[PDB]
PDB file of C-alpha atoms (C1' of nucleotides) in Angstrom:
ATOM      1  CA  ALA J   1      -8.291  -3.707  11.276  1.00 19.49           C
ATOM      2  CA  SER J   2      -9.689  -6.540   9.244  1.00 17.43           C
ATOM      3  CA  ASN J   3      -8.075  -8.211   7.485  1.00 17.88           C
ATOM      4  CA  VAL J   4     -10.366  -7.849   4.257  1.00 16.82           C
ATOM      5  CA  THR J   5      -9.242  -5.711   1.908  1.00 14.78           C
ATOM      6  CA  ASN J   6     -10.138  -7.088  -1.977  1.00 15.55           C
ATOM      7  CA  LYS J   7     -13.515  -4.984  -2.074  1.00 15.31           C
ATOM      8  CA  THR J   8     -14.244  -3.943  -5.438  1.00 15.85           C
ATOM      9  CA  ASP J   9     -16.905  -0.803  -4.815  1.00 18.73           C
ATOM     10  CA  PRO J  10     -16.465   1.996  -6.469  1.00 20.61           C
ATOM     11  CA  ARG J  11     -15.721   3.741  -3.263  1.00 21.28           C
ATOM     12  CA  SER J  12     -14.126   1.061  -1.476  1.00 20.71           C
ATOM     13  CA  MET J  13     -11.290   0.323  -3.770  1.00 19.39           C
ATOM     14  CA  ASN J  14     -10.224   4.182  -4.099  1.00 18.35           C
ATOM     15  CA  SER J  15     -10.276   4.802  -0.571  1.00 17.25           C
ATOM     16  CA  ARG J  16      -7.695   1.407  -0.430  1.00 18.71           C
ATOM     17  CA  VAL J  17      -3.817   1.738  -0.972  1.00 14.86           C
ATOM     18  CA  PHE J  18      -1.449   0.005  -2.974  1.00 13.66           C
ATOM     19  CA  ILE J  19       2.225  -0.943  -0.927  1.00 12.58           C
ATOM     20  CA  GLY J  20       4.461  -2.507  -3.523  1.00 12.84           C
ATOM     21  CA  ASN J  21       8.102  -2.696  -3.660  1.00 11.05           C
ATOM     22  CA  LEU J  22       7.771  -3.910   0.186  1.00  9.21           C
ATOM     23  CA  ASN J  23      10.212  -6.024   2.269  1.00  6.86           C
ATOM     24  CA  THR J  24       7.818  -8.105   3.369  1.00  8.04           C
ATOM     25  CA  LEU J  25      10.160  -9.907   5.926  1.00  8.61           C
ATOM     26  CA  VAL J  26      10.711  -7.288   8.627  1.00  8.54           C
ATOM     27  CA  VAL J  27       7.006  -5.649   7.931  1.00 12.67           C
ATOM     28  CA  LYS J  28       3.525  -7.377   8.302  1.00 15.28           C
ATOM     29  CA  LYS J  29      -0.198  -6.595   8.613  1.00 15.63           C
ATOM     30  CA  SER J  30       0.221  -6.202  12.307  1.00 17.09           C
ATOM     31  CA  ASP J  31       2.685  -3.622  11.605  1.00 14.31           C
ATOM     32  CA  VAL J  32       1.722  -1.520   8.509  1.00 14.12           C
ATOM     33  CA  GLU J  33      -1.899  -0.726  10.832  1.00 16.72           C
ATOM     34  CA  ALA J  34       0.565   1.138  13.026  1.00 17.30           C
ATOM     35  CA  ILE J  35       2.663   2.816   9.943  1.00 19.21           C
ATOM     36  CA  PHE J  36      -0.209   3.716   7.831  1.00 18.56           C
ATOM     37  CA  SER J  37      -2.309   4.047  10.714  1.00 17.38           C
ATOM     38  CA  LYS J  38      -0.959   7.846  10.869  1.00 18.29           C
ATOM     39  CA  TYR J  39      -2.527   9.079   7.561  1.00 19.88           C
ATOM     40  CA  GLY J  40      -6.116   8.006   7.763  1.00 16.39           C
ATOM     41  CA  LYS J  41      -8.038   5.137  10.000  1.00 21.59           C
ATOM     42  CA  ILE J  42      -7.772   2.160   8.518  1.00 23.20           C
ATOM     43  CA  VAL J  43     -10.526   0.039   8.550  1.00 27.53           C
ATOM     44  CA  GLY J  44      -8.699  -3.058   7.003  1.00 30.50           C
ATOM     45  CA  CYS J  45      -4.955  -4.276   6.355  1.00 31.11           C
ATOM     46  CA  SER J  46      -3.480  -7.053   4.485  1.00 32.63           C
ATOM     47  CA  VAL J  47       0.410  -8.264   3.373  1.00 29.19           C
ATOM     48  CA  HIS J  48       1.341 -10.838   1.427  1.00 25.14           C
ATOM     49  CA  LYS J  49       5.103 -11.389  -0.434  1.00 27.64           C
ATOM     50  CA  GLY J  50       6.707  -8.330  -1.995  1.00 29.65           C
ATOM     51  CA  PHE J  51       3.093  -6.015  -1.726  1.00 28.32           C
ATOM     52  CA  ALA J  52       0.695  -4.987   0.886  1.00 29.72           C
ATOM     53  CA  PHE J  53      -2.779  -3.732   0.907  1.00 31.87           C
ATOM     54  CA  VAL J  54      -4.655  -0.863   2.898  1.00 34.91           C
ATOM     55  CA  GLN J  55      -7.918   0.290   3.423  1.00 35.28           C
ATOM     56  CA  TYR J  56      -9.214   3.529   4.711  1.00 35.36           C
ATOM     57  CA  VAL J  57     -12.969   4.751   5.430  1.00 38.14           C
ATOM     58  CA  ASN J  58     -12.275   6.862   2.836  1.00 43.54           C
ATOM     59  CA  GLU J  59     -10.313   8.205  -0.187  1.00 44.89           C
ATOM     60  CA  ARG J  60      -8.674  11.203   1.019  1.00 46.28           C
ATOM     61  CA  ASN J  61      -6.959   8.900   3.601  1.00 44.47           C
ATOM     62  CA  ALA J  62      -5.543   6.957   1.123  1.00 42.64           C
ATOM     63  CA  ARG J  63      -4.657  10.687  -0.869  1.00 40.26           C
ATOM     64  CA  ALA J  64      -2.630  11.347   2.524  1.00 40.10           C
ATOM     65  CA  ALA J  65      -1.012   7.847   2.744  1.00 38.88           C
ATOM     66  CA  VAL J  66       0.222   7.882  -1.090  1.00 42.23           C
ATOM     67  CA  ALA J  67       2.021  11.119  -0.749  1.00 40.64           C
ATOM     68  CA  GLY J  68       2.929  10.437   2.949  1.00 45.90           C
ATOM     69  CA  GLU J  69       4.755   6.901   2.772  1.00 47.33           C
ATOM     70  CA  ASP J  70       5.622   6.709  -1.417  1.00 48.47           C
ATOM     71  CA  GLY J  71       9.095   6.979  -1.354  1.00 46.70           C
ATOM     72  CA  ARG J  72       9.678   6.378   2.389  1.00 46.36           C
ATOM     73  CA  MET J  73      11.982   3.435   3.624  1.00 44.51           C
ATOM     74  CA  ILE J  74      11.390   0.222   4.745  1.00 43.88           C
ATOM     75  CA  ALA J  75      13.078  -2.036   5.947  1.00 42.20           C
ATOM     76  CA  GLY J  76      16.461   0.167   4.880  1.00 42.85           C
ATOM     77  CA  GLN J  77      14.107  -1.274   1.586  1.00 40.12           C
ATOM     78  CA  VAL J  78      11.906   2.013  -0.314  1.00 45.10           C
ATOM     79  CA  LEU J  79       8.195   1.893  -1.093  1.00 41.52           C
ATOM     80  CA  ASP J  80       6.524   1.930  -3.669  1.00 42.13           C
ATOM     81  CA  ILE J  81       2.605   3.110  -2.888  1.00 41.91           C
ATOM     82  CA  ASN J  82       0.020   4.322  -5.003  1.00 38.02           C
ATOM     83  CA  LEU J  83      -3.682   4.644  -5.112  1.00 41.04           C
ATOM     84  CA  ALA J  84      -5.496   0.660  -5.436  1.00 44.47           C
ATOM     85  CA  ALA J  85      -7.053   1.738  -8.677  1.00 44.83           C
ATOM     86  CA  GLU J  86      -5.256   4.591 -10.235  1.00 44.04           C
ATOM     87  CA  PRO J  87      -2.197   3.021 -10.972  1.00 46.20           C
ATOM     88  CA  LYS J  88       0.796   5.415 -11.655  1.00 45.80           C
ATOM     89  CA  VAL J  89       2.332   3.680 -15.454  1.00 48.84           C
ATOM     90  CA  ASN J  90       3.982   0.655 -14.027  1.00 48.29           C
ATOM     91  CA  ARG J  91       4.121  -2.025 -11.561  1.00 49.42           C
ATOM     92  CA  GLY J  92       5.877  -4.866 -12.021  1.00 50.06           C
ATOM     93  CA  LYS J  93       9.397  -4.717 -10.235  1.00 47.76           C
ATOM     94  CA  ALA J  94       9.779  -0.763 -10.995  1.00 49.40           C
ATOM     95  CA  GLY J  95       7.973   2.016 -10.517  1.00 50.31           C
ATOM     96  CA  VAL J  96      10.177   5.436 -10.221  1.00 49.61           C
ATOM     97  CA  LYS J  97      11.915   7.224 -12.713  1.00 47.81           C
ATOM     98  CA  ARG J  98      13.488   9.830 -10.061  1.00 46.78           C
ATOM     99  CA  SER J  99      16.486   9.591  -8.064  1.00 50.38           C
ATOM    100  CA  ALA J 100      14.146   7.328  -5.412  1.00 51.61           C
ATOM    101  CA  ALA J 101      17.225   9.644  -2.874  1.00 54.37           C
ATOM    102  CA  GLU J 102      15.906  12.843  -3.041  1.00 56.16           C
ATOM    103  CA  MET J 103      14.578  12.963   0.097  1.00 57.35           C
ATOM    104  CA  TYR J 104      17.570  11.905   1.933  1.00 61.46           C
ATOM    105  CA  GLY J 105      20.096  14.285   0.597  1.00 62.89           C
TER     106      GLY J 105
ATOM    107  C1'   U T   1       4.658  -4.658  -6.735  1.00 64.93           C
ATOM    108  C1'   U T   2      -3.126  -5.582  -7.242  1.00 64.85           C
ATOM    109  C1'   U T   3      -5.151  -8.501  -2.452  1.00 64.77           C
ATOM    110  C1'   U T   4      -6.395 -12.886   3.075  1.00 65.37           C
ATOM    111  C1'   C T   5      -5.653 -22.070   3.261  1.00 65.56           C
TER     112        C T   5
END
RNA sequence: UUUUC
């Protein structure tokens, strides 16, 4: 997919997914487009330090990946995934107040 | 943990 993910259009930033709390030491922009492509058709993807971004054809595909990968385990570390335009409550270094393990036991 | 020498 394309390396572009920073579009600010009133639909392109809602068809985007923010992937915070990412390990980034074992996952790259050539892997996110193979792990998030199962929840929607990716039209762009980028990875950074501690976070990544994925761009879909529409917001529906973003809701499927935010609900399909948030709290999944990558590189042995849980991810914190959310829409790129509707952040939950917190972002920096934290964003979960649950057991973060209720899906593994 | 909000964006690509």
